[PDB]
Amino acid sequence: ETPPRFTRTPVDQTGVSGGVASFICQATGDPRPKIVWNKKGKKVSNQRFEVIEFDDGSGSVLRIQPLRTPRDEAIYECVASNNVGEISVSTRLTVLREDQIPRGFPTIDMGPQLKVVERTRTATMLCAASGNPDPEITWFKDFLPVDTSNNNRIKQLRSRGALQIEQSEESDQGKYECVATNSAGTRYSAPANLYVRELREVRRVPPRFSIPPTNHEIMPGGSVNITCVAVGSPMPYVKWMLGAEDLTPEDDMPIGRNVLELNDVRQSANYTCVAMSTLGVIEAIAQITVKALPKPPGTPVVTESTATSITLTWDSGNPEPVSYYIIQHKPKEIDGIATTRYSVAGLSPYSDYEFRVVAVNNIGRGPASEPVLT
Amino acid sequence: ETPPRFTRTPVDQTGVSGGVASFICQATGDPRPKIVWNKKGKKVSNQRFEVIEFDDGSGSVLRIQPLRTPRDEAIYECVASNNVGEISVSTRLTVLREDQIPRGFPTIDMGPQLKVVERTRTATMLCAASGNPDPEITWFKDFLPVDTSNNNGRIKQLRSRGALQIEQSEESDQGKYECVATNSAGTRYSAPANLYVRELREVRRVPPRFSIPPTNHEIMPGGSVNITCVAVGSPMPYVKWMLGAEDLTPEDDMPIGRNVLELNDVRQSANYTCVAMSTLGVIEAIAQITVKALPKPPGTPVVTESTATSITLTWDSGNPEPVSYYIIQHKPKNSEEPYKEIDGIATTRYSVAGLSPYSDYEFRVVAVNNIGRGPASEPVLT
Amino acid sequence: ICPKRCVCQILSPNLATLCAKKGLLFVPPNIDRRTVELRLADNFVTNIKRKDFANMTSLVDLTLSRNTISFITPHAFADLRNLRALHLNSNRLTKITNDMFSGLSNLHHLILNNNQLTLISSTAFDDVFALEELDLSYNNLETIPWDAVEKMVSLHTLSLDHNMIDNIPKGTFSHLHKMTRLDVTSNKLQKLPPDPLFQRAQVTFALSFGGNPLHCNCELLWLRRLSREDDLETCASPPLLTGRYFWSIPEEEFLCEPPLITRHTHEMRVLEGQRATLRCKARGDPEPAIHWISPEGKLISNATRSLVYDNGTLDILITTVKDTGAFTCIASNPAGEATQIVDLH
Amino acid sequence: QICPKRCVCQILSPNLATLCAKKGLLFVPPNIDRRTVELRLADNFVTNIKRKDFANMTSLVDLTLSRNTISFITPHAFADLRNLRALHLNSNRLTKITNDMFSGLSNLHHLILNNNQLTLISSTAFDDVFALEELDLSYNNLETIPWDAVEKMVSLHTLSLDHNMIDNIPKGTFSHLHKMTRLDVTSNKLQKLPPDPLFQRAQVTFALSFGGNPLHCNCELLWLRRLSREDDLETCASPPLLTGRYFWSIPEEEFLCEPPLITRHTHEMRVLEGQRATLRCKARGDPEPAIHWISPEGKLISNATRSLVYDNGTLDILITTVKDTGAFTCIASNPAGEATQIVDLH
Ligand SMILES: *[C@@H]1O[C@H](CO)[C@@H](O[C@@H]2O[C@H](CO)[C@@H](O[C@@H]3O[C@H](CO)[C@@H](O)[C@H](O)[C@H]3NC(C)=O)[C@H](O)[C@H]2NC(C)=O)[C@H](O)[C@H]1NC(C)=O
Ligand SMILES: *[C@@H]1O[C@H](CO)[C@@H](O[C@@H]2O[C@H](CO)[C@@H](O)[C@H](O)[C@H]2NC(C)=O)[C@H](O)[C@H]1NC(C)=O
Ligand SMILES: *[C@@H]1O[C@H](CO)[C@@H](O[C@@H]2O[C@H](CO)[C@@H](O)[C@H](O)[C@H]2NC(C)=O)[C@H](O)[C@H]1NC(C)=O
Ligand SMILES: *[C@@H]1O[C@H](CO)[C@@H](O[C@@H]2O[C@H](CO)[C@@H](O)[C@H](O)[C@H]2NC(C)=O)[C@H](O)[C@H]1NC(C)=O
Ligand SMILES: *[C@@H]1O[C@H](CO)[C@@H](O[C@@H]2O[C@H](CO)[C@@H](O)[C@H](O)[C@H]2NC(C)=O)[C@H](O)[C@H]1NC(C)=O
Ligand SMILES: *[C@@H]1O[C@H](CO)[C@@H](O[C@@H]2O[C@H](CO)[C@@H](O)[C@H](O)[C@H]2NC(C)=O)[C@H](O)[C@H]1NC(C)=O
Ligand SMILES: *[C@@H]1O[C@H](CO)[C@@H](O)[C@H](O)[C@H]1NC(C)=O
Ligand SMILES: *[C@@H]1O[C@H](CO)[C@@H](O)[C@H](O)[C@H]1NC(C)=O
Ligand SMILES: *[C@@H]1O[C@H](CO)[C@@H](O)[C@H](O)[C@H]1NC(C)=O
Ligand SMILES: *[C@@H]1O[C@H](CO)[C@@H](O)[C@H](O)[C@H]1NC(C)=O
């Protein structure tokens, strides 16, 4: 047999009233040291004081909740005793009131929120703190300290002292508390239950345009509904952009189907349809071009002229291709001229005529050009 | 025996739909004529039609309520028949719809409201009408016409408002009184009004009388005062307040028996009138509210005692209100310089010492009260 | 045919859909339109839409009792041509607009008890004029469209067990001979109009008017002479009778007061066409009725050329050159007719 | 010794009780013995109370104003009721609960306000009845209550909210309230429910009812699903895929939550030299993510000077300083996800 030896002794912690304070104590020996907590040589009795036995059975944790002052301001001792021997160590407890909080006391900037992760997945309990000096972060699962000494599953992150739990399991379910501590004192955070569920097995498929944005051609100041549909699991958030600017406030974003309702289109421009999920970002372009009225063609010039016929030639006078032209003539309009040249026949000998040319496209009929005498 | 003779035949009246129409018919004879109403030679059957037997039993009244059109537009006949004979007369009823009302149709400007009068007292059912021509007023108690033929003494119709003055009310007067207007255009009924007769209430009728009259007061400028006025008697009078021309209290909020006027910021002295009024006359009362002002100049100071270096002054208060202290102004005879004042004189006499040999002085006396300091009185030489 | 969690049974000759106590949050999407009875009682529906009861023509009885309904889409109760009974008791309804019950001719039973009704728009009942029962108890109502109620001849039961009703017209309950029960307990009624139906409540008709701030004057003497059973009624005014039971007070103590004119205009000089305002007011129990007279007639009410009644003030707008004569102010009352005169020039 | 007319007040050792139930009263009896201990004004028709009514009633331990037409209560009218233990204000027309009402009721153990029209309850109105045992606020129009005052009620065991329109409920509650034995929150507008060891004790001591609520059946309610309670006809409202089906008819594997995704963030921004710099960062998911920001090293303040925070997902530093350039990163907290993106400023 061997008399008990303290491998780690409890330290003097300064907690705040209305909060929680926990003390750790564990030792080794043969047989295993049965640890009992005492106050002024008296075992704890009050309901607010609770002792939690370790999984090893080689130690115990005394949790005090809630903290009060100066009702709980006293000195406590940890007694590890077995058949061969008995040892004990004392520690001081300081409980500061809410109006006694010093300037620079640990403050929970961000406490752990409720989280749920499936089996064999990464869990990340978050926490943050501030004060003078910078407090370090310790975690408490099920009123017990988490063993994050060295890189063994459960690791504390180097500086944001989160609790990255890789390869989650059944035993990981419990109440996770966050604790900040410096030279000023110790502050606990709000509890957060962690639950682990079975594997869901969902097919993860990147975003894909089911119905791509079709091109369109609209008259000046013409409203138009362009539609864009994307599918996949998970469903992507479809939006619209003018390259630099966006239309939707991103607060109300539809799933799978987005219909952009445009209005008063004055100038041709490209609209971008973007769908985005957790599996990447895809893009698509919708063509909105404005078709306008034809400009007046070039002034018709009499290239050939006979007794009963006069030939007209002219320039298109348009950047866009022209379907056909309409020749006006009088001392009556000639429709259906697919070329830029036409011979007006059936005229009187020795007679002066006036000729105009009009361009017509898919939109409609443009203005008449400047006339020509002959 | 004697064959029946019509004492009163029904007339053609033009009523409106949704209203009420009543027909009268009574005759005499031996034996008493039993009157039956008929339509197209058929006795009335519908629930809306009801026949009311007269107190005499010599007649009957056919009341139709409510009126509809053209369901009731038809000709009706009144048959008075007994053992000796049988007689009958016909009359037409016209029921105009709401969209057929002509311009100048009888209109109830004011219908009879519910009234309650004690026994052996005057009852007055009121009614008014208008139209072209001017319609006359007929009353209907308990679905029966009211006998207002001549000035008997019991029930009289008023004429210069065709009211129903019922003097010396009794048990039989209890019932439903309806008002009816009728001209050449048609006939319109008014809203019913139940009349109830109770026992005589032996109450002592005593004119208004001030229990606690408004007491006089004297308040400092810009102050406040609670003036109270209480009147008693049966019936209790409504007490208000007036400043002669203007009234203070709203005519919606007038207290009974006791009125307390709460004044504030009293700027000028004035009389306020307290008026209490019941059904037995109007009484009045005056509350004296006077503002205390600066003191009047005291009596001219008279040299009672005089030495080489001291002069004693005596004077009258010259004030109805008590004076706190006095201030003696003093200067040489021909001194054209501002006066010198001696403050803190609690009495009406003070000896000014420290004077020059062979020198005439001038002395003035000023009164000071709680308000402030008044003017200076006429001086005295020596 | 019938939605999930709902037990809709088919019995000759009418189809009934039962969905009581099912924890429903909104109306079931696929209810058979040719249903006849529909129980959605004891659920938790927040609001109704038009698509809910759109084509339910064969519906004769709808039950929406004990829910959390706070708003109903206008014209949602439309097309319910054969609906006879409607149960909307125990909910959170606030207003009654005309668009609600429009087109419900065959409705015989209308139940709105245990709600938070504040206002009921006029003509909202001008389609349910042929109902037999109207329950408006346990609400915050003060006035209802009485005009629509008078056109309900087939009415026999009107429930107003708990409201804040100011007063009630006198011309009502005239053609409503079928009335067999009327409860007006726990309201703010000052007086009650005399009606032959109330005379039939002596020992067929059963009325309850307890828990009301009664103004025990001679205007309620008719009800006192009526020897009904004591239903714990209590008077509120006059102060001399305040507190004592309505039935513990002798008939001789129910007194009224003759009017008295407090103040009137002495003389008036209203040249230049200016507005001529005359003032005359009287007090009494109950409040007198002020009327004005011409030399021999009375003028028009609330119309051109005349201002009348309340305020007790004649305003002739822009007066004419010649309106001088003899004008007299009066005050109507169940026991008195006091009056005084005033001249104008 | 003195009891008002129409009232039957009996004298028993050592406390005087005045009974005035069903008397058709229109207002409070004017001359009630102030040394009374029990007072029943139930089933009457009182509209409003005045200070003079319950002024000197110190010995009063039980007051009953059940089933009336009460619409207004005088401020400081329930004062001087130092020994009042039970208060019944059920079935009335109360609209608001001001602090002046229940001020000075330390010994009050039973407070009943069911079947009313309560719209608003002012804060600190319950900061005197902190030692009560029962609070009935069922059948009302309430949406929020002063929870902070409720947490200070350790001796609470019964809280009734059978029919309301309550929006949500804090997570820190029911911590010190170990005495809780019954809690009913039926027929409300609750989206979710916080996990508490008292709810774990409701399996087959504690009895809770949460039916008739627009439940948001996600992974945030999985703990209640694992809880094998009896079916009380509970029904889900969202997600739309689960809308309509019973809470207990849905397998545990179908209560899913969604990891956040940042939709849009500012690519670059040039607001040096102290001009106003507005930053944009937003993410969506089920449930709604929690957006936090970091400086090059550390996180900033909430709702205070030098920082704008939380909702909108927008950093506004008011009038920025000359040198605030560095590496800034946006995050999104979630029960199942921790998405993040980065943004630089110069
Ligand atoms: C909006 O969408 C349009 C696609 O439908 C794009 O239209 C393109 O504009 C380009 C000029 O900016 C043209 O590129 C030219 O193409 C010719 C051969 O066709 C080359 O020789 C030129 O080098 C090349 N010039 C440039 C500057 O790239 C395209 O011809 C034209 N394509 C079509 C189908 O019309 C627009 O680019 C696009 N606008 C924006 C801002 O994205
Ligand atoms: C986009 O599509 C909608 C219908 O899908 C169009 O609907 C118009 O607006 C309302 C519908 O809320 C209807 O009452 C109108 O009759 C519709 N007008 C037309 C011309 O259809 C809408 O026009 C389209 N929007 C744009 C900008 O084109
Ligand atoms: C208030 O009432 C008194 C009493 O009449 C008034 O005193 C009279 O005033 C007139 C002149 O104003 C004198 O001629 C009388 O001799 C006074 N009579 C008495 C008995 O004193 C007083 O003037 C009134 N004050 C006001 C402001 O009206
Ligand atoms: C109620 O029934 C009518 C027809 O029985 C429905 O009206 C039809 O609705 C569909 C589209 O939903 C149209 O294709 C038909 O042309 C409509 N027919 C007529 C005559 O209008 C009506 O939709 C139903 N009510 C509701 C709310 O769906
Ligand atoms: C502090 O942050 C909170 C949001 O968490 C804001 O509190 C809101 O304040 C209004 C009253 O002004 C309440 O009606 C809201 O219910 C509160 N919202 C929440 C979620 O509690 C508050 O606006 C912020 N204050 C400042 C200066 O930013
Ligand atoms: C949330 O969003 C809007 C802008 O999208 C904010 O509106 C700004 O409010 C501040 C004042 O607090 C103004 O200086 C800005 O000019 C407003 N911005 C715009 C574009 O108008 C709104 O205040 C934000 N609310 C919160 C709580 O952040
Ligand atoms: C006089 O009126 C004032 C009004 O504030 C009141 O405070 C005071 O009690 C009254 N005094 C008497 C004797 O009525
Ligand atoms: C008459 O007019 C006033 C407003 O001008 C109105 O408030 C009142 O209700 C009307 N009274 C009658 C009897 O028409
Ligand atoms: C009614 O009386 C009030 C007095 O407060 C007055 O202001 C109002 O002008 C009067 N109404 C009319 C139409 O004269
Ligand atoms: C209450 O008690 C006090 C004794 O301090 C007394 O002065 C006061 O008149 C009492 N009020 C009532 C309404 O009894």
Residue numbers in the entry:
A (entry chain C): 28 to 179, 181 to 187, 196 to 367, 375 to 417
B (entry chain A): 28 to 187, 196 to 417
C (entry chain B): 19 to 221, 232 to 373
D (entry chain D): 18 to 221, 232 to 373
Reproduce, without paraphrasing, sentences from the article in which this PDB structure was first reported:
Type-IIa receptor protein tyrosine phosphatases (RPTPs) and neurexins are the two major presynaptic organizers. In mammals, the type-IIa RPTPs have three members, PTPδ, PTPσ, and LAR. These members possess a large extracellular domain (ECD) consisting of three immunoglobulin-like (Ig) domains and four to eight fibronectin type-III (Fn) domains, followed by a single transmembrane helix and a cytoplasmic domain harboring two protein tyrosine phosphatase (PTP) domains: the first PTP domain is active, while the second domain is inactive. SALM family proteins have five isoforms (SALM1–SALM5). Their ECDs share the same domain organization consisting of a leucine-rich repeat (LRR) domain, an Ig domain and an Fn domain with 35% amino-acid sequence identity. We determined the crystal structures of apo-SALM5 (LRR–Ig), and PTPδ (Ig1–Ig3)–SALM2 (LRR–Ig) and PTPδ (Ig1–Fn1)–SALM5 (LRR–Ig) complexes at 3.08, 3.16, and 4.18 Å resolutions, respectively.
In the PTPδ–SALM5 complex, the electron density of PTPδ Fn1 in one complex in the asymmetric unit was unclear, probably owing to the structural disorder. The interactions between PTPδ and SALM5 occur at three interfaces. The most extensive interface is formed between PTPδ Ig2 and SALM5 LRR. The second interface is formed between PTPδ Ig2 and SALM5 Ig. The third interface is formed between PTPδ Ig3 and SALM5 Ig. The meB-containing linker connecting Ig2 and Ig3 of PTPδ is stretched along SALM5, enabling PTPδ Ig3 to interact with SALM5 Ig. The meB insertion likely plays an important role in placing PTPδ Ig3 at the position favorable for the interaction with SALM5 Ig. A pseudo-C2 symmetric hydrogen bond network is extensively formed in the dimer interface. In the central region of the interface, Arg110 of one molecule hydrogen bonds with the main chains of His180 and Asn157 in another molecule (hereafter denoted by * after residue numbers), whereas Asn158 hydrogen bonds with Gln134*. The notable feature of the PTPδ–SALM5 complex is its 2:2 stoichiometry, which is required for its synaptogenic activity.
